[PDB]
Amino acid sequence: PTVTMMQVEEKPDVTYSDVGGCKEQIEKLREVVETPLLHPERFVNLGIEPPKGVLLFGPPGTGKTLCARAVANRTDACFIRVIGSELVQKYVGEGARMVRELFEMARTKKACLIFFDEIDAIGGGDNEVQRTMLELINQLDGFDPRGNIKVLMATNRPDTLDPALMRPGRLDRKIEFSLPDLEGRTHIFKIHARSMSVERDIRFELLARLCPNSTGAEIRSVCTEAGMFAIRARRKIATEKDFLEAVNKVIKSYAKFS
Amino acid sequence: GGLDNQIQEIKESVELPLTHPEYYEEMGIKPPKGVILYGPPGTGKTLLAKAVANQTSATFLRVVGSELIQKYLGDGPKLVRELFRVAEEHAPSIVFIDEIDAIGTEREIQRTMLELLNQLDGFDSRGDVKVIMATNRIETLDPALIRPGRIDRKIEFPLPDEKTKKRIFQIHTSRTLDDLIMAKDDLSGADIKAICTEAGLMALRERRMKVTNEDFKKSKENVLYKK
Amino acid sequence: LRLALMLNDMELVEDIFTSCKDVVMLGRHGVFLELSEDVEEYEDLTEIMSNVQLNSNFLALARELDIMEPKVPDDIYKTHLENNRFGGSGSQVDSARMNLASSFVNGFVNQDKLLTDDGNKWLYKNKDHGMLSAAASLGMILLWDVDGGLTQIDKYLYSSEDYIKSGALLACGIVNSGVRNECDPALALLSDYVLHNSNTMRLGSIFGLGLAYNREDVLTLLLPVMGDSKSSMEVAGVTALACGMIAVGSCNGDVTSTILQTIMEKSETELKDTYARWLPLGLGLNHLGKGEAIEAILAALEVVSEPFRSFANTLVDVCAYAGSGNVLKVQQLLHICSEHFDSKEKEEDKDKKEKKDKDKKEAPADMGAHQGVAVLGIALIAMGEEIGAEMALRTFGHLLRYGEPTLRRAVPLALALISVSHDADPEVSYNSIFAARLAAMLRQLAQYHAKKGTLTLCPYHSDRQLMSQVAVAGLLTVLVSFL
């Protein structure tokens, strides 16, 4: 369908210079996505084989921002993403043809990187799902395509028990996705300066130090819900005094139950 | 009647595109989401009267309910993609969806409505057309439709049942209130416009506008017995 | 007063002036009193009333002073137009033709007068035709303040350039219609007969004097003009249009030696058929006002010749059918509609907008369903300038998208004349179609001016011949049909 030609991840986004407080994890999952392609000879010459990937799970929070970092900071050619919602569809059995055509396009792209999104939509009879994941681990364990290929499993619920017991073979680094900090959000706002026309009267420090418990999704609702709440009245200028109720309401009315 | 603030607020809401071009192209708002409405009374004429302001100077498109999907095999979102491509070739238009009651009349509705949710957000298309969704009960929608779908603004239309009926009924008697503010359970603009239009034409028929309580309960009994 | 609009009699306006004067608003009925009256009954009215009038007050009203003395101050006071149209539409002009569209921006007025006096060199950088148009624009912006119009247009009088002073005399003809004090300085020098500045001053002065105006002295002065027969088309253009607009509303027309002279001299030399196209303008304008004239049969007897004067004859048939119960002309219209000649269809079928101009329910027909581009032009011209119902714009939906520059250029004019949020949206559609030079100049024209009276029904049949050189564009911008 349209997801085949639309599967390419064009239109780069959040870069590395605007990371959301990630200090150690950004290296733990960066040294496998950015450095192995920059220095392939060190991994093949120094030891057994280059690392494959890491594991990301837990609360959503600032999810998909680090994958946006991988898309933006790509050196030569942006990689291809894979979502889980394209597998569970009508006329079951198409998952084998889909994984064979994305493996065919992956080998057409000299064995580039593959990003798996929402593995819990198909994980958790699932014999065709076992065919997809066992064809993934089976066709990817072979050194024939490449050794620098990287997978990335992102999920919200750890209820995928079968992938959790099949992952220790190839995958590793079972760690939480990312914890949010307090000082890094001003860079998410600095890259949100390329968003819609925020009036220059707003100060990023005043909007930054007046909102605790401001995880990446919640500040995404600060800029997103702030802008759209400024489109409620279809206004033209967006001053912080106009949507301050949207700010303290989007942090407090949402911080009531959570 | 009486809902002037909500109709001027939704008027300024739906009158940003195609009007006032000196700031719409210089500021750069261009929201590719539209608004989402609903109403416990519904009846299509209240929400159609709230979104009817787009029909002044524009091209209107109306798709009421998913009945054309459930009456066929599992084709799914292909017709939605046909409306997306014809809406891309017909950008100066308004996508109006009304009476979303697929469950008020099951697993497929969640996946074709999830695909309609993802494709409706505009992941592969920038600001091209406005999408307006409308239903009757907000509790019938799945919680997945909250973050992607409802991002701009939702309206909270109250059902007084004892204030708007007294206002409109007072407008009718201006030319025995508990019987019609208690007996009636749904009103809209097509009722006052209907019985006032045929009341004016009837006043052209018999050349007098005198309204008696028995003739008004007979004309009410016509609509009550009609349904 | 409508009975005086249809009767065109002086006893009705005299009896309504003594019966409307005996019982005393005033400036309003003066406004549509001068608008409702034609050329004949305001000159007979101004001669019997200029004879006595018994109070001279309706003499003060029935001039070009009290129809405009309430308008200009009210148009400046009660209206407030922004400057982003003069600045923007006056800023995206280039290629020496969008700047001509900006000369239309300056020309069309109806408050702000910034683009008028935006420095100098705006008329020097422009071409000769743009020197005439921009020279008459200062006359089109000043249809008031005779004392100010004289001291504003006087700078361009007798200047070093010919088109500056000729367009300045045209400006003097546009600014006023009852002063007639600028005639002599231009009228005296007209006798040159070969090639002189007074030929273009004859264009602007005979045309402007025709806009200012059974007058015999100006026609005896126009006798050497019609007898000159200069190669310039606009000489006999503004001459035939001038005497024609002077002779509108005559009592059952006339067969005098004026139109007999221009018909004999028309048949004298059958060269430059544009003369044979714009002489029927003045002919049919002289035919206007008849009720029982047999002049159509007279022209059907004498004028019948090769299809040139047969096109003149069918133009006399166009102006001869202003409207009555004559369904014989409807079945005759359907009969002769299939003629092989590809111009008498355009004009004889173009008469639809004048014949049935009142009953607009029958005007929508199957003209759009044909295959000839000329027939689509017949429908597009048949749209007109009415209130612009949704059926008209429905016809502009299919008629708007066309490939020929004559119809793509002709569609925004009727699109913006029939509708005076549907103003800028069709213009955005033109921006989606185009984004040549003519379509750009005309689409900017519509960008600026988008926001049975003979004065409003006369000056577009000359606009029906726009598919020619830019020489006509010098006279196309000074039309009087703009209210």
PDB file of C-alpha atoms in Angstrom, chain B residues 18-19 56-58, chain C residues 84 421-422 424-425:
ATOM      1  CA  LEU B  18     -10.042  31.690   2.924  1.00  0.00           C
ATOM      2  CA  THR B  19     -10.645  34.978   4.804  1.00  0.00           C
ATOM      3  CA  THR B  56     -21.136  31.024   3.023  1.00  0.00           C
ATOM      4  CA  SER B  57     -18.333  31.338   0.436  1.00  0.00           C
ATOM      5  CA  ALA B  58     -16.696  27.926  -0.067  1.00  0.00           C
TER       6      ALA B  58
ATOM      7  CA  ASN C  84      -1.734  47.799   1.185  1.00  0.00           C
ATOM      8  CA  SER C 421     -15.803  35.928   0.188  1.00  0.00           C
ATOM      9  CA  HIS C 422     -16.017  35.683  -3.609  1.00  0.00           C
ATOM     10  CA  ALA C 424     -10.335  37.305  -3.940  1.00  0.00           C
ATOM     11  CA  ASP C 425     -10.982  33.543  -4.093  1.00  0.00           C
TER      12      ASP C 425
END
